[PDB]
Swiss-Prot record:
It comes from Saccharomyces cerevisiae (strain ATCC 204508 / S288c) (Baker's yeast). This is Cytochrome c peroxidase, mitochondrial. The record marks 45 as: Transition state stabilizer. It catalyses: 2 Fe(II)-[cytochrome c] + H2O2 + 2 H(+) = 2 Fe(III)-[cytochrome c] + 2 H2O. The keyword Methyltransferase does not apply.
Length: 291
């Protein structure tokens, strides 16, 4: 399967910076969502789940085709709760009907991270919508109730290595688990709509307790009111993972730099970019624009 990036006709940096600003302006406006967390965390989760279907072996799945717009992927049990990120973006797609679905879902994730004061993420245009029959089947996204060997093995399919996996998981400092979506409940920290390295700090400094929640699932709970998933706590159980966790709890700039590279790579897996294709765009935030 080859998927070649095709820039939307005649579009350039300024067009996509207009779509960025539209998403970012609505993130500021619709602030009440999920008890004032706002839409940013569900939008970086949506960009991860449309990319996380990729399989390196046959180049199926991935962010290129925008296939989450089809019922099979929209109704995947693993995507429960992401309909709220879709409905947030649907106004903006009506306003810029020329951007492809893959591009709009991935730029929403980029915009949310930078607007929640994360690192800049280089983003590239050119994903092309593909037919309903290209939609990957349910079951390619990871279970939460498993251990470190499962996480390592699952992420080899998206060929991410240990460092990349640990840098990507730092995004679980954002938002929260919702019992009616996943059977898990609670936030992982106090700053859950500002991008920081707090996931790593909480993992190493809190007093975790294995408890059973109302959906009868086990999760790691702390006195402070935070929770960690079994696959999250996995990172301090494995010796290779645990020493990268310590590296990111001791250096927030290295965390930001490595997250930026692994999230771009995540979003680009499966796509062939021609050598005459434009460079990756670095978008300015509303704040850097005085907007
Ligand atoms: C083995 C890996 C992973 C598993 C099992 C997993 C699982 C989960 C689960 C069960 C939730 C709760 C969903 C809900 O109830 O609403 C969640 C939320 C979230 N995850 Fe993951 N995740 C994984 C990796 C990642 C990665 C790599 C990213 C992003 C780079 C990510 C970003 C998020 C975000 C931002 C949320 C919060 C959503 C919200 O607030 O609504 N996840 N994760
Ligand atoms: C620990 N955690 C927070 C959001 S998803 C998992």
């Amino acid at each position: 399967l080859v998927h070649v990036a095709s820039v939307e006709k005649g579009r350039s940096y300024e067009d996509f910076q207009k779509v960025y600003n539209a998403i970012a302006l609505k993130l500021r406006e619709d602030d009440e969502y999920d008890n004032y967390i706002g839409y940013g965390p569900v939008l970086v989760r949506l960009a991860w789940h449309i990319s996380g279907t990729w399989d390196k072996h046959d180049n199926t799945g991935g962010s290129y085709g925008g296939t989450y717009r089809f019922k099979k992927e929209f109704n995947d049990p693993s995507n429960a709760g992401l309909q709220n990120g879709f409905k947030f973006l649907e106004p903006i797609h009506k306003e810029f009907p020329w951007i492809s679905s893959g591009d709009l879902f991935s730029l929403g994730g980029v915009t949310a991270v930078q607007e929640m004061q994360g690192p800049k993420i280089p983003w590239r245009c050119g994903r092309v919508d593909t037919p309903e029959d290209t939609t990957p089947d349910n079951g390619r996204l990871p279970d939460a109730d498993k251990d470190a060997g499962y996480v390592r093995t699952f992420f080899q399919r998206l060929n991410m290595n240990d460092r990349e996996v640990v840098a990507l998981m730092g995004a679980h400092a954002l938002g929260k688990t919702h019992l009616k979506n996943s059977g898990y409940e609670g936030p992982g920290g106090a700053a859950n709509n500002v991008f920081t390295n707090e996931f790593y700090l909480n993992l190493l400094n809190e007093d975790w307790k294995l408890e059973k929640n109302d959906a009868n699932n086990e999760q790691w709970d702390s006195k402070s009111g935070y929770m960690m998933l079994p696959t999250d706590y996995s990172l301090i159980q494995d010796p290779k993972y645990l020493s990268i966790v310590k590296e990111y709890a001791n250096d927030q700039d290295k965390f930001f730099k490595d997250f930026s590279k692994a999230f771009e790579k995540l979003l680009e897996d499966g796509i062939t970019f021609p050598k005459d294709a434009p460079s990756p765009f670095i978008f300015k935030t509303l704040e850097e624009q005085g907007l």
